[PDB]
Structure formats: structure tokens, C-alpha cells
Ligand binder design. Structure first.
Ligand SMILES: Nc1nc2c(ncn2[C@H]2C[C@H](O)[C@@H](COP(=O)(O)OP(=O)(O)OP(=O)(O)O)O2)c(=O)[nH]1
Lengths: 368, 58
């Protein structure tokens, strides 16, 4: 929250960070090690928003660079298609054409008419949501601040946006809209939210400067679609965050001067907000006791599987969301017979793992 | 005898020879269970059943 420049140097972690990447957290461990001890000034979440093609990745990178937080790169839909040895399951051709063949943002931009697009439309929310928990994991373990370029909280903007265009199904809009509640209740809202505001034309200027053969030549980029971002951001998405997180809105990144943004954020302090607890703003961060800190900490360092399993929602009332059994059976055959998927990561000795016959270790929230 | 004697009928007069299997059966049942359980462990975890024989030996 405070810039290194006003520190005349770097920031220090108040206590030794906990190896949450490689270590499991236990309730025994909570008794054996306190949580908010590590916590410091910057222990907060600064979320970013803006109309698409706002280039905010470089902004957030520099902002986290000169305020000493984590960047946490943006959505990476490919990770579904990536594995312990990289290669793309998109490599696997339309052997199983109907609903097993891939769909990336490229495919969406080339054609949002395909019902299979709805797949990532929800899986994209999960990726955001999984990232968010990663951010909370990093906060509560290290006490260091974080900056997510985009949030699951904001994802519904694109959701209603695509549906208004007609691309998603009336069924899918209900599915995602109700399903957000199920998980979205279980996340802490960010401390601070910064939203960037260019007009639809202006972003079209920049998106034509992105020169992306799967976007710039695409056809989705109607003013209506790229404007629905504006209305939804303006009122629908902002207001609830405006209730909880402190909201700053500069014009945009390009004229957005980092240093003044640095100064404006730093000027906005929260000790002012250490008044009455019952205040609804910052509400999701008032942790009374060190024990309650540890409850939040263990709940994210030891219940990420639980967090993922909330997604298990049964809905076989939507055809595009249903899969053909026998085809799906083959889709299972392809994935787990394909190179580097037979076993757990680190145990695909067919693809190279050594040290087996004695190795019995498994990583905290290690995928499977 | 011609005399249904309860005590002598009950008495451990012997004539009970254990098999080569009679005592050994439990050891080669519990160990077989534990070995199979370890194979069960790796089978569900998507790990090689052979791998990590330290679990199987223990
Ligand atoms: N269907 C769908 N597509 C999304 C969503 N959010 C982002 N995208 C798509 C639209 C974009 O063409 C593409 C991301 O392009 P961006 O405009 O974010 O590039 P930008 O200059 O902002 O830098 P960056 O993406 O952060 O590397 O992914 C979403 O929520 N739903």
C-alpha cells in the first residue's frame, strides 16, 4: 500500500514466510505457529478492472513492482490443455469432434456461435476463482500483498455480456448465474479495486494495435459487446465492490501515471477504517483473534480441494453442458493414455520420472 | 466307550495336529491384506502399485 520510493528502499517481511507452496498446513500446525504475526501493512488485495484490450497486465506488473506485491498473471485457459510436460491437448485433433475438441479464446473470437464455447465460459470463471484462492494463499502465508489483474467477482460481466449478444444459452446464463453464488460466497472481497475507463471506440483503437490474428481479424468485436463491459462495470460489477472495497477510477492505463496512482493509493489509508467493526466496508477482513486468523489461513492452505469441490454441481438439463457417454468414455481414454498423464505428476515414469520405487511424496493441493 | 461322559468327551485328549497351514494362515492373511491395501493405495492415487515399496513392506 506504501511505495518503496517513500520507503527510501525495499520493504521487509516482518517474519519468516511459511513455505505454503511446498508444505501442508495443519490445525496442529496452527497451534504450533501463529498467523497474523507475519501480517504487515501491505497484506491486502488490489484488484484491477478495465474494458478488454486495456493492456493492464503491464500496469499491474509495474504497480506490484514498485509497491512490492505479487503480479499473478492473467487467465491462462491453456492450463487445462497443459501438463507436467507442457504439450497441448489441443494437439489431439478432432478424434472426438462434438464436445471433446478444444475451445480457447481464439476459438471464441473466431466463432462464439458454437455451443461448446459455454465450456470455457464457466471453466474460465473457475480459473479466475482458483487463481483468487492462490492469491489468498500467498497473502495469508507470507503476509505479502497481491494484485490480481481480474477477478471471479468481475467475470459475470463478460458472462451477461456474451449472453446479451446471444452467444450463450438461456440455460447457460441460469447455470452460471446461480452457480456463482455457490462458490463466490466463499471468497474474501479485495481491499481495494482500481477500474480503468476508456470508451468503446478507444479500446477498439488499441485492440487494433494488438494485431492478433485470432482477435483483431475476428468478428466478435461489435460496439455492443465491447460496450456491455462498460455498463456492467459501471453499475452492476462496481457497486457491490464499491460497498466493500475502496474504489478508485482514473481515466485509463495509458494516461494512467503509475506514480500518481501510487500516491493516490498510498494516501488512501485504512487505519482510518479501523473504526467500528460492524461497518460493512472492509467487512470480510475483520479477524478478531489470532485463532480466527488461523481459521482463515487453514481454510485456504488446507481446504483448497474443498474449495474446488464446491464446483461439483449436477446439471444434466443443459445439452451443450452434457457429454456423450461413450464419446466421453473415449475422451477419458485419450487424456489418461496420452503422453504424460498415466499417473500423478512426478510418477509418469513412462515420460521420464526417476526416483520411483521409493518415492511416495505428494504436493499440497498437487492437482489431483 | 459306551458311556457318554461329558468331562472325558471335553478333555483335551489330543489328536489335533496343526496343518502346515494351521498356524501360518493368519500371517499370510494379514500381510497379504496390508500388501493389497498398499496396492489399493497407489491404485486410487494414480501412482504405480509397485512404486514406494516401503509402504508395502511396512
Ligand atoms: N468469453 C470470455 N472471454 C474473456 C473474458 N475475459 C477476458 N476474455 C477474453 C477477451 C480478450 O480477447 C481476451 C484477453 O485479451 P485482453 O484485452 O485482456 O489483453 P490485455 O491488453 O488486456 O492484456 P492481458 O490480457 O492481461 O495480457 O480474453 C471472459 O470473462 N469471458
Amino acid at each position: 500500500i506504501s511505495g518503496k520510493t517513500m520507503r527510501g528502499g525495499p520493504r521487509v517481511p516482518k517474519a519468516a514466510p511459511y513455505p505454503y507452496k511446498t508444505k501442508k498446513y495443519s490445525v496442529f500446525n496452527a497451534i504450533f505457529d501463529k498467523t497474523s504475526k507475519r501480517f504487515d501493512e501491505n497484506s491486502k488485495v488490489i484488484c484491477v478492472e478495465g474494458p478488454i484490450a486495456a493492456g493492464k497486465s503491464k500496469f499491474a506488473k509495474e504497480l506490484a513492482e514498485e509497491l512490492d506485491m505479487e503480479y499473478y498473471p492473467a487467465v491462462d485457459l491453456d492450463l487445462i490443455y497443459i501438463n507436467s510436460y507442457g504439450y497441448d491437448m489441443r494437439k489431439l485433433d478432432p478424434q472426438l469432434p462434438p464436445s471433446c475438441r478444444s475451445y480457447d479464446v481464439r476459438n471464441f473470437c473466431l466463432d462464439p456461435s458454437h455451443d461448446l464455447a459455454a465450456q470455457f465460459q464457466i471453466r474460465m470463471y473457475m480459473l479466475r476463482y482458483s487463481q483468487y484462492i492462490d492469491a489468498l494463499q500467498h497473502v495469508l502465508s507470507t503476509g505479502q500483498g497481491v494484485v490480481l489483474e481480474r477477478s471471479p467477482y468481475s467475470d459475470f460481466v463478460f458472462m451477461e455480456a456474451m449472453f446479451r449478444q446471444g452467444y450463450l444459452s438461456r440455460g447457460a446464463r441460469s447455470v452460471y448465474n446461480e452457480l456463482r453464488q455457490n462458490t463466490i460466497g466463499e471468497l474474501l472481497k479485495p481491499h481495494l479495486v482500481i477500474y480503468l475507463d476508456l470508451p468503446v471506440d478507444a479500446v477498439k483503437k488499441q485492440i487494433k494495435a494488438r494485431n492478433v490474428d485470432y482477435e483483431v481479424q475476428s468478428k466478435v468485436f461489435s460496439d455492443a459487446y465491447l460496450s456491455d463491459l462498460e455498463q456492467l462495470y459501471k453499475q452492476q460489477y462496481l457497486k457491490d465492490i464499491s460497498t466493500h472495497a475502496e474504489l478508485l477510477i482514473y481515466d485509463w492505463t495509458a494516461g494512467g501515471e503509475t506514480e500518481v496512482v501510487v500516491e493516490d493509493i498510498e494516501r488512501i489509508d485504512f487505519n482510518q477504517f479501523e473504526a467500528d467493526i460492524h461497518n460493512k466496508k472492509m467487512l470480510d477482513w475483520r479477524f478478531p483473534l489470532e485463532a480466527e486468523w488461523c481459521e482463515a489461513r487453514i481454510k485456504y492452505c488446507h481446504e483448497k480441494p474443498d474449495l474446488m469441490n464446491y464446483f461439483n454441481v449436477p446439471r444434466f438439463d443443459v445439452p451443450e453442458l452434457v457429454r456423450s457417454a461413450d464419446d466421453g468414455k473415449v475422451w477419458r481414454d485419450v487424456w489418461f493414455n496420452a503422453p504424460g498423464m498415466k499417473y500423478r505428476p512426478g510418477y509418469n515414469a513412462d515420460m521420464g520420472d526417476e526416483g520411483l520405487l521409493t518415492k511416495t511424496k505428494i504436493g499440497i493441493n498437487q492437482g489431483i | 466307550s459306551a458311556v457318554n461322559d461329558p468331562l472325558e468327551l471335553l478333555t483335551n485328549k489330543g489328536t489335533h495336529e496343526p496343518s502346515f497351514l494351521s498356524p501360518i494362515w493368519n500371517p499370510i492373511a494379514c500381510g497379504v491384506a496390508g500388501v493389497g491395501a498398499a496396492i489399493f493405495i497407489n491404485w486410487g492415487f494414480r501412482k504405480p502399485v509397485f512404486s514406494g515399496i516401503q509402504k508395502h513392506i511396512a
